[PDB]
Design an enzyme around this catalytic site. Structure first.
Site, mmCIF file in Angstrom:
data_model
loop_
_atom_site.group_PDB
_atom_site.id
_atom_site.type_symbol
_atom_site.label_atom_id
_atom_site.label_comp_id
_atom_site.label_asym_id
_atom_site.label_seq_id
_atom_site.Cartn_x
_atom_site.Cartn_y
_atom_site.Cartn_z
ATOM 1 N N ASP A 52 0.838 -1.198 0.000
ATOM 2 C CA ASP A 52 0.000 0.000 0.000
ATOM 3 C C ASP A 52 0.876 1.252 0.000
ATOM 4 O OD1 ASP A 52 -1.955 -1.911 0.356
ATOM 5 O OD2 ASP A 52 -2.562 -1.197 2.362
ATOM 6 N N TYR A 110 7.104 -9.891 6.385
ATOM 7 C CA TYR A 110 6.950 -8.455 6.639
ATOM 8 C C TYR A 110 7.507 -8.095 8.007
ATOM 9 C CZ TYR A 110 3.579 -7.743 2.806
ATOM 10 O OH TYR A 110 2.961 -7.668 1.587
#
Lengths: 249, 249
Positions: A52, A110
């Site tokens: 994002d 992540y």
């Protein structure tokens, strides 16, 4: 002709995300594709995943097809003369003509970074979430453990609707006492993630760390998979796509 | 009226320098003095030292005079609501109305970050000097050792008119294998530094590490105080003013 696996590092702050979106918007995929011609490659870059707006990457994989005869070891340097200062190729490898950066990935990892201290940090303002209050690491670790394994993680996704069962392979918390200050690092590893999921998990865990019904509340969100039960999505500047793994060949 | 000792952190990349330079340029002093009235303080700030365009600070001391009744505990937060995102107060303490941030300092410490790795780092592009070639860490330590002690450091200086004799108390290398690559940090602590001195010592040391006559060649620079013999000044973005020590009195 020749297909290559490109690893990219990027500061996502001045990008509207990875995926090319049209209407002039500046994206990571857009900027890599803008430069591929300069090396004799088709202007098409297939990424292992999607980040994002604002989120960063250490080694985001993209596969590309180069018509040219450039030696592999020369591709990063060549693309880097063309790419903007906030996006660089940090690795390249010749792969099978068949290779698919997204589908062939074994897993994606992540990392989210929280900087705990009394005052904001100009130096790390776009690299970590500044948190002023004390954090309960024990409560956070007990919730983190609830997330491990096979679950329907949709209660943590965003504009997500899609078959939500995923299997979180790893979810660990690390405290590293840096000089810029103390940092709490949340790491997540899984085959793939729902869109918004990691930031979702992080915002609720943060609530756990402060005050928000104990880790216990995370079982309801995993059970019902109801988004309204989670906390707010954590800000993007503290999130980093770490790496993807692929089977040998 | 009270005299406060403020400690500030700043990302120097969008500042022309610490002290005001006129020409409508944005400086750290300018922005701090811009904020100071919102706290009922005189719009004047005197720093413990100087930082060129692009160099950072973790804890740069400044003395200011507050007229209002504001409690010391509250000024970092009050100034921070007014300050820009790349500069914040990370500490405040009441001192003698007679206290001088620059004249009363026992010493100042600086740190320079070098990141050795194959490719540029977009995430650390304004935080560390990217170096591709390996560093002869042995030669750098030899040279570092020649710099310790009392000398006329004017050969490492740039545009300075003060007496050149100074005493370098510490000068050490610290290497850490890290995630972004090999982290090489150079640390220096001395009572005070000449203008451009730290960047000149670092620049000459990089040459050593890379291929500048042996470490020996620094002897010539210290003996003769001739800046024509020193290496190029080190790029600003890798330099950090760490802290300053004052006498408890």
């Amino acid at each position: 002709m020749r297909r290559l696996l490109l690893l990219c590092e990027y500061d996502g702050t001045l990008f509207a995300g990875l995926q090319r979106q049209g209407r002039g918007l500046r994206t990571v995929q857009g900027e890599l594709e803008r430069a591929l011609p300069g090396i004799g490659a088709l202007p098409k870059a297939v990424a292992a995943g999607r980040t994002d707006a604002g989120v960063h990457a250490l080694a985001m994989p993209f596969h590309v097809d180069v018509e040219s005869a450039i030696p592999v070891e020369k591709v990063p340097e060549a693309l880097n003369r063309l790419l903007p200062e906030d996006l660089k190729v940090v690795g390249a490898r010749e792969v099978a003509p068949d290779f698919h950066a997204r589908k062939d990935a074994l897993w994606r990892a992540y990392r989210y970074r929280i900087l705990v201290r009394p005052h904001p940090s100009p130096l790390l303002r776009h690299r970590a979430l500044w948190v002023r209050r004390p954090l309960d690491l024990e409560a956070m670790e007990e919730a983190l453990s609830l997330l491990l394994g096979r679950h329907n993680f949709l209660g943590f996704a965003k504009e997500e609707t899609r078959p939500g069962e995923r299997e979180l392979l790893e979810a660990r918390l690390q405290v590293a006492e840096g000089e810029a200050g103390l940092e709490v690092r949340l790491y997540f590893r899984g085959k793939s993630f729902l869109r918004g999921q990691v930031r979702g998990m992080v915002g609720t865990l943060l609530e756990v760390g402060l005050g928000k019904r104990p880790p216990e509340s995370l079982k309801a969100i995993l059970k019902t998979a109801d988004r309204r039960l989670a906390g707010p999505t954590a800000p993007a500047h503290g999130l980093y796509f770490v790496e993807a793994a692929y089977p040998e060949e």
